[PDB]
């Protein structure tokens, strides 16, 4: 995965292949091992979900969290689409109805 | 000849000396105008044209999203913030989610989470308004010139003699038009686009190369993203949350999704809607009537000065019969005498030789000087049995014809139709300006309302006995001291005198 | 039907002679309905002289 810093904050460009595995990079504090448990992760495409995942103490188990690192809070970003066909999932099935007349 | 095969056909006859005459045209019918010395004309309204329509509002049924971002803050930190909140193209939602030691911070409370994403409209539909000054009507004018009557000339490319057919574009800017029919002459038309379909409660909906008409109170009720009509490459949208569905909640993020194509919902909702057609940016409407006034001053005949035909006339087939009791006759002429007048008479017996009916086509004539030529005419046979005779000498041909119904029935039907027509012409019927046209107007409409029955009832149109009957009726109404017996009798007498003064 | 239209057209062709015959037959009945029958006789015999 790509690791960059824009304005004193770390961005981790993670593709689809690195799904369910940890990665180690370097910060101003030192080495950082960060785990990624993204279940709905997709291929690389303009539709990119990005969310900060926070640092926590190893003596606690993750709860409703699919990303955690231990140096600081790290911002993760990854595409969300199917088979690199340039198409989002858009599986909402809201089926909004309109008045007849 | 454009008015032969039409279900909704009328008949308008004006005064002999009366140049002006008013008519009403329906989008699904036709009008036939006849006179004593003028050739028969046939008016039809083809299409209502709407052009240069302004845009009012545009909706977006199918949309896409990209660059979803979120930010979460737990208690003792305040509201969440994102730089993309201030941008009009990014929509976000706020919420509160439960947090704890498992999520990063200590205090046991709910925090503030915000999530926004871009919004790009891939497909959209548009709504236009219709103003009266944009409408433009098209009326075709045909002339009964004893044409062959063949339906081989559908478009306007060729096979349309410019002296036999014409097209007129009535606009709201200039309602006065001058029509040139070539050798026949010129006419004047003043049409008033009034009493049509209301266009203050209708919106022209364009969607997926298709078009409809919708109600204004319903167009604003639709729950979809929208934006007004502003010429620009990137537009600001409102109420786009109706197309972007956010998940329930998550301790660190929120994943939004976009709805699919709502084309099916619109197609289902517009089932009971009116439809139309369009070419480029112009639209075509098939509903709406029109009122017109025709001035026939320079209109004349074409073959009034021609001679008689000394050749051989023959029927080309059995004469057909239309729904209005009119008979079309298709003749074939042999000989080379040039354009000559067609001698045709309608009587009750071969030895009588007395004109009993009238002709819908005035001055029937042959158009070319060929050896074996063809022509067509349209006549109105009298109720009952009749004989059509064509030609003179020992070569004249005869044909039997029959027509059901009653003269009184047709007279009453025509009178009721004329009364309905005069009732439709509520405004712009008379003129209250300069004096001298008021008596002309009252005479004109009493003629247009009662001549159909006058011609059918009062004998053989002698023009001499009717004047004496009117005079004696006026005398009977004059020598009467009782009320309500002199006014009505004098009115009927004057009515009959005027109707005999007109053409019979 | 078959004869009404014929006599109607005949009346409308020459109404003077028809009215003359009607006013002649009007004064040749003993009762009102009898006068009506007498004038309808002329109405019926009007098309064919024979
Ligand atoms: C993060 O945790 C890993 C786990 O072994 C450790 O190797 C690394 O040094 C930690 N980072 C720090 C303490 O900055």
Numbering used by the authors:
A (entry chain B): 1 to 101
B (entry chain A): 1 to 504
C (entry chain C): 120 to 169
According to the publication:
The surface of mature, infectious flaviviruses is composed of an icosahedral shell of 90 flat-lying envelope (E) protein dimers, the main target of humoral immunity. The pr domain of prM binds to E, obscuring the fusion peptide and thereby preventing unproductive fusion within the already infected cell.
Furthermore, hydrophobic prM residues (Ile96 and Leu98) directly downstream of the furin site, bury into the surface of E, providing additional stabilization. The pr domain of prM connects to the membrane-associated M domain via a linker region encompassing residues 102–119. No density is observable for this region, possibly indicating high conformational dynamics. However, the last clearly visible residue prior to this flexible region is a histidine (His101), which is inserted in a hydrophobic pocket on E. Although the prM sequence is relatively diverse compared with that of E, His101 is highly conserved.
